[model samples]
Target: AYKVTLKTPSGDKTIECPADTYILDAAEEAGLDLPYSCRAGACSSCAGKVAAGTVDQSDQSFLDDAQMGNGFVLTCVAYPTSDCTIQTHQEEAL
Candidate 1:
């Protein structure tokens, strides 16, 4: 498991996320309230910025290469590749 720190408007939340688990699910398991729409990667409502570390978003088809390069991720389908720090609730910022 890896440590994931989520920065949100409410506050920052930290949780343990397995490499194969989606970040959103991990946050939910940790009892963290995060914004999300489609559970699939077809929407941007769960968008976030990877402030640190990398994630495997191979299953996500919504974000463009440019957005992904800018550290954007669809947390609903994003799987951490390392300890990560992400800014959540960033749909408007996208």
Candidate 2:
């Protein structure tokens, strides 16, 4: 996928997710411990904002259309399309 940087309470974290790997998995595999529940894109806890870059969120369902427009993504399902800057714990629902 891409290299992703995340702003978190501990500090800024970065990880690389391949095109076949989900963003959330990449973060966790890199020791980020990002919040997530359903790993199948049906949950909102994994939702967050992509401050920059693009992703393939077509497999997601929990997030409303407005959220997606705001760069919100279900990290559990999103695969990066380019290097991205993101933040966690955004509007999880609605």
Candidate 3:
């Protein structure tokens, strides 16, 4: 198992999840009530800030261009590249 952390307005909340767990799912398992719409990367409703660590890090195409560059990564398809910290329901990083 791998541990993932999420940065909420309060502080860091973490959970032990499988390596295959999506970052958003980990948050959900940790009882985090983050914002969401579509649970897919096609929408930005589940928007998050990658305050620390890498993602399934990418510089890709046809997906979010400005977002990931600005520290906003979609959690639905994202997972930790290292133990990570992410923010939600707080000061918007964007």
Candidate 4:
């Protein structure tokens, strides 16, 4: 399991979830109303930033290496590699 912290405009909340679980799924299970549309990685509605730690993303083209290089991630497609903190509702890193 890993600890994931979400920073929102409203405030911040922390939750523990398995390493293989998606960050968006963990937030939903914790009753957090994070912004989201397409459940898959086709959209940016569930996008955010990795303030700390790392995550592995599924094979998708919505995000490229440059965006990820700036810490941008799609929460719906991200699985934690370690305990991490994220700022939610972010659209991009640039």
Candidate 5:
């Protein structure tokens, strides 16, 4: 479990979640109104970019290899390895 921050287009959001909690799940629980399709590791619907901090890829199906090395993460499969910050709503531009 960990506490993290999300650098949204609007502002920075924070929440506490279990270690295994997906970023999408934390965002939704924090009232982010996050956009998502399947909560599994397959859809890019819940994808986001880690602008700061780190996480462990428990699943990597939807994440491109390059994005993984960069900062992209499918919130559905991403779990915090340490406190972190990320950008959401990327799909809005997609």
Candidate 6:
């Protein structure tokens, strides 16, 4: 499992996420509440900026290549590929 650290307005939280599991699911399992909508990766409600490490977002389509390149990801479909730090509760205007 990879360690995923989430930076949120409430505070920071860390959870164990398997490479095959979505970060959002891991966060939920850890009892962390994160903003989200369209859990199918069709929206930006679960958007986050990567501060460190990497995640696999191949299953996500809401974020374009440029956005993904800029460290933005849709957490609901993003799977941690390495220990990572992400700022949560970010909203991207569609």
Order the candidate numbers by lDDT, best to worst: 1, 6, 4, 2, 5, 3
Ranking by TM-score: 1, 6, 4, 2, 5, 3
lDDT of 1 by residue, 2-84 (tens): 99999989888889999989999999999988889888999999999999999999989899999999999999999999999
lDDT of 5 by residue, 19-47 (tens): 87777878788788877888778877877
User: What is the overall TM-score of model 5 with all chains considered together?
Assistant: 0.86
After superposition, which runs of candidate 1 have C-alpha atoms over 4 Å from their true positions?
none
lDDT of 4 at 20: 77
Q: Number of the top candidate by lDDT?
A: 1
Best by TM-score: 1
lDDT of 4 at 89: 89
lDDT of 2 by residue, 1-94 (tens): 5779887768888888888888888888898888887688897888788889888989998887878898888889988889988888765433
Which residue pairs in model 1 clash with each other? Answer: none
Error of 3 at 62 (Å): 7.9
Q: Which stretches of candidate 5 lie over 4 Å from their true place?
A: 92-94
lDDT of 4: 0.87
* TM-score preference between candidates 2 and 5, better one: 2
Least well predicted 10-residue stretch by lDDT in candidate 4: 57-66
C-alpha root-mean-square deviation, candidate 3: 3.0
Model 6: per-residue lDDT, tens digit, 1-94?
9999999889988889999999999999999989887899998999999999999888787888888888998999999989999999778432
Q: Write the per-residue lDDT of candidate 3 for residues 18-73, one digit (tens) a residue.
A: 65677778777778777776766666666678777677734222246576677777
Candidate 2's displacement at residue 76, Å, is: 0.3
Q: Model 4 compared with the native: what TM-score?
A: 0.92
lDDT score for candidate 3 against the true structure: 0.68
The clash count for each model shown is 0, 2, 1, 0, 2, 0
**Global lDDT scores for all candidate models:** 0.94, 0.83, 0.68, 0.87, 0.78, 0.90
Cα distance off (Å), candidate 5, residue 6: 0.9
